[PDB]
Amino acid sequence: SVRDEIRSMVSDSVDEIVDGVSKTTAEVINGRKSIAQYATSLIESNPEPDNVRTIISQPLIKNTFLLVGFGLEKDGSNINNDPSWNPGPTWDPRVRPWYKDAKNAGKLVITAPYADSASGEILVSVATPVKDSATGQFLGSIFYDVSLAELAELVNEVKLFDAGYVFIVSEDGTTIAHPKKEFNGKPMSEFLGESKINVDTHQVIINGKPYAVSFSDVEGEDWYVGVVIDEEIAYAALDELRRSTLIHHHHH
Amino acid sequence: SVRDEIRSMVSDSVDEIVDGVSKTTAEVINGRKSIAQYATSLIESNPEPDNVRTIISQPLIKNTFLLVGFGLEKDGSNINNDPSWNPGPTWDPRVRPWYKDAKNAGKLVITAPYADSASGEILVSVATPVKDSATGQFLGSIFYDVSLAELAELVNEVKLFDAGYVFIVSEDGTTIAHPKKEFNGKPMSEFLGESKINVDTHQVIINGKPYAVSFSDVEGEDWYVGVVIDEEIAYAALDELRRSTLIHHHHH
């Protein structure tokens, strides 16, 4: 009954992977949100353009986000942290989804996926409203852009026996991050066949071949981490481990 | 040969635990170092006391560190982020280990454990020198205090089968964080018997009982994570898992 022991380990492995990655993802994303909130709070204390630039141009900010910009309600001007960035002459921050999301929420949010103004790539942004200390009046919003390809790479650093991959979706099945960039912002049905999240681990047929799919909620956003695993490949990897370990122990 | 399979899983589990925790620890500590560097860089841009206070008094800073203070070379004054903190009337930041460590290193460092001036608790600090923009002359140093009890709790969040615990030591065997506060800053021999780090997983006798001990380097500091595990307890936990899984599968 070795086949049984290993098949059981595969099934359990699928669940432990998705649970672990959802915890990892929550930690990373919450960390970035906290950095964004800190920068925003400093800006609210003194929103003078030079001070804004100093706050958003430090290595921590440059390395944590793709791009950061503060758009002003008064005139649609912006202060950003990349002199090379140019969204075109008619760009108005006040009509962008990050700006409206933050304005309407009145607190830090993460946007749904949308197409970047300059690059056209699908991304999400952490977005915060800026209120002046004295009056609490809306001065504008700040975006902190998040690369979805980077997020996909990050969650796939997990060991998966070469048997599949991890992805992130929102509660309605919208793809947040897939190893294949083409699916970002698109319905997960485009790569899973299934359109809605079924949290219980289950089999799915893709390209006429069976895969195990499982999900786990991400605490802090309305996202889930999903995994797609070829259990035949996983079984082989684990069986190899078992045999290799035995042999090695005979001579050590 | 079920005993063999499980004993093997225990041995492998010991190693995977220490490796995983050392990766986790590196990530968390590097994150805190990056936040400290960011705050320091903002302060260097404008070290006026009110601006310093604004930078260090935000929730992110308050929540990431126990306490933050900027000590001045000129007169031994300080600006800190806790009006309730009082180290006594003769406290001079310029003679403290965090201050000298940062001054001498000329870059961000983490101190060896030392006794806090106000509380007497053993802690470590992230410490950074502050140089003025124009002249690059030393203005003073900033400490960002790290709770060792919190760090011990953090690294012990890992699942250990109720079979033992995780700790952190520096390369010379000095305890950085132990679940039992009494050992912090003391030689690891006080709880392990062994005085030097042996990275290969090995058996150690403690209180006349055998334990498996393993270590893994932490990238970014001269620290190691160690684990002490009762393999008899671990075997039982894993055997229970195997049996429970089998039974559950018979009816599901």
Author numbering:
A (entry chain A), B (entry chain A): 57 to 308
Reproduce passages from the article.
Extracellular signals are sensed by methyl-accepting chemotaxis proteins (MCPs), also known as chemoreceptors. We determined the crystal structures of the ligand-binding domain of Mlp37 in complex with l-serine and taurine to reveal the molecular mechanism enabling Mlp37 to accommodate these structurally distinct ligands, l-serine and taurine. The ligand complex structures and the mutational analyses demonstrate that only one of the two potential ligand-binding pockets (the membrane-distal pocket I) is involved in ligand binding by Mlp37.
In contrast, the l-serine complex forms a dimer with a molecule related by crystallographic two-fold symmetry. Taurine and l-serine are bound only in pocket I in the crystal structures. The amino group of l-serine is in contact with Tyr-170, Asp-201 and Asp-172, which are triangularly arranged around it. The indole NH of Trp-154 and the main-chain amino group of Ser-173 also contribute to the binding of the carboxyl group of the l-serine ligand. The side-chain hydroxyl group of l-serine is recognised by Asp-172 and the indole NH of Trp-141. The slightly open conformation of pocket I in the serine complex enabled us to visualise ligand binding in vivo with a fluorescently labelled amino acid.
